[PDB]
Amino acid sequence: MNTVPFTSAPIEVTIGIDQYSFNVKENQPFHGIKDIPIGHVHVIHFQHADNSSMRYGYWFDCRMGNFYIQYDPKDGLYKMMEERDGAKFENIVHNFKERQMMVSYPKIDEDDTWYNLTEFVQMDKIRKIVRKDENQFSYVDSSMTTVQENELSDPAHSLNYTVINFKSREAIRPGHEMEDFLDKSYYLNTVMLQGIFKNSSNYFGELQFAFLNAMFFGNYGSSLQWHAMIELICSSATVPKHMLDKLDEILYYQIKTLPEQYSDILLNERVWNICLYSSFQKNSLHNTEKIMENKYPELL
């Protein structure tokens, strides 16, 4: 079990760690989060009490370094940093634990939610979507735009998701215009899976990361990317059976976890009705269709 210590908490803030959150008051003696499960990526995220504008946070994997949080009064945010002196870090953490100065990652033993949401998400792939190679962790916030959003403006601060565009020469083979537009299997299986992602695990990883950035930061470009990656599968007549079964599980846990009050802005009516009721895969997503019909029947 790993730890992310905080130097202090000078401004009142709601701190999230994966799907959990807790309020910290201005200058409340607070020093961090302990008992963080090893083996998963994690996200630690922030919403200031004075400006609910800009949720922001850091994707990290404790196996890649010792990370801590320190508030910067000049830039006005909590910053993740890496401590390279391992003895200094063990000592700081042990002292804060002895003082009972860290809250517990509050995982219920039965609960596989975080695993199910991050099954295919890897830090190395996150770091290629969020380019900042001098840090081992990755900053994301509500306002960052995607490469594809910039094509339709600061490149260093962009989400380099894989561009998907159904009306593009990449998606459409000369001479198969109708065929490839109405059945996207060649775009899915040859262009994207074999060509760009190499395997379905990397495809699902990017899909899962896009959803999590949509959910945790309200990042609109990430929501667009999540839906496009769903629609590309559902609009393909030929999809490996194991991919359909895994997609159903992936989406089930995403819909299960989504805040009920955010479904109006995070779910695209057209994509979901097309995917569940009109597409080639309308009958292949049983778990997802059942939870969608019982939890968000209005959308449909």
Binding site: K167, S168, R169, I172, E177, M178, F181
Partner: protein, 237 residues
């Protein structure tokens, strides 16, 4: 964006543009089978592709053999239309290629956009006008060449005959749409109007009769009467 009453003079400026109407591409007769079921029989159709400034009509005749063995023909018809328009554009010299293509039905937007990905600088546009180009097959010479075709064929016409020698494109298009609207609302009466006086003839190289300027005014008046009437006979007013 969409073409409508507010940007109507744009049709007659000096940017090359084409209307594409696909309503006569897939045509069928519906009939009973020996068993008392219903079946369709396709008949030859056509793509109506019109330059509204010059009157040049690229009439691509769609022979029934294109449908043999195909499924979902009404959907295929849109894609076949887009394929043929894209082939037409590629066949023209660069300086003759349109800068905009306006489709009369919004369901043509995606098929044409996909077939024209190669041409990022040609705008594909819908329209809010309810243009009467479906009535093109009420023009006898156009109907005749479509029905007689035994293979795929492109036939070029000027749908304005020689009108542009005496009137502007705006006026020619207005006359064209009035004639087609009339033919669409009441084909029998519309055609009676156009051909009643046997002394006025259709030249071999023309589609419409050789009316004098004064006779066109009378003709146009009779067509507006027809359209308003049928609008009464139809709504009882």
């Amino acid at each position: 964006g969409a073409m409508n009453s507010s940007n109507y003079a744009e049709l007659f400026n000096n940017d090359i543009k084409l209307f594409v109407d696909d309503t006569n591409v897939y045509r069928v007769t519906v009939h009973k089978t020996f068993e008392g079921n219903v079946a369709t029989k396709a008949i030859n159709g056509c793509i109506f592709t019109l330059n509204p400034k010059t009157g040049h009509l690229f009439l691509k005749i769609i022979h029934t053999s294109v449908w043999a063995g195909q499924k979902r023909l009404s959907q295929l018809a849109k894609w076949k239309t887009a394929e043929e328009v894209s082939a037409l554009v590629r066949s023209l010299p660069k300086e003759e290629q349109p800068k905009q293509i306006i489709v009369t039905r919004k369901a043509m937007l995606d098929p044409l956009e996909v077939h024209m990905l190669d041409f990022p600088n040609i705008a594909i546009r819908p329209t809010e006008l309810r243009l009467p180009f479906s009535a093109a097959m009420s023009i006898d010479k156009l109907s005749d060449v479509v029905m007689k075709a035994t293979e795929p064929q492109m036939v070029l016409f000027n749908i304005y005959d020689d009108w542009l020698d005496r009137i502007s494109s705006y006026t020619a298009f207005s006359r064209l749409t009035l004639l087609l609207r009339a033919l669409k609302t009441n084909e029998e009466s519309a055609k009676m109007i156009l051909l009643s006086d046997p002394t006025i003839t259709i030249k071999s190289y023309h589609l419409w009769p050789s009316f004098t300027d004064e006779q066109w005014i009378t003709i146009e008046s009779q067509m507006r009467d027809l359209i308003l009437t049928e609008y009464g006979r139809k709504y009882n007013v």
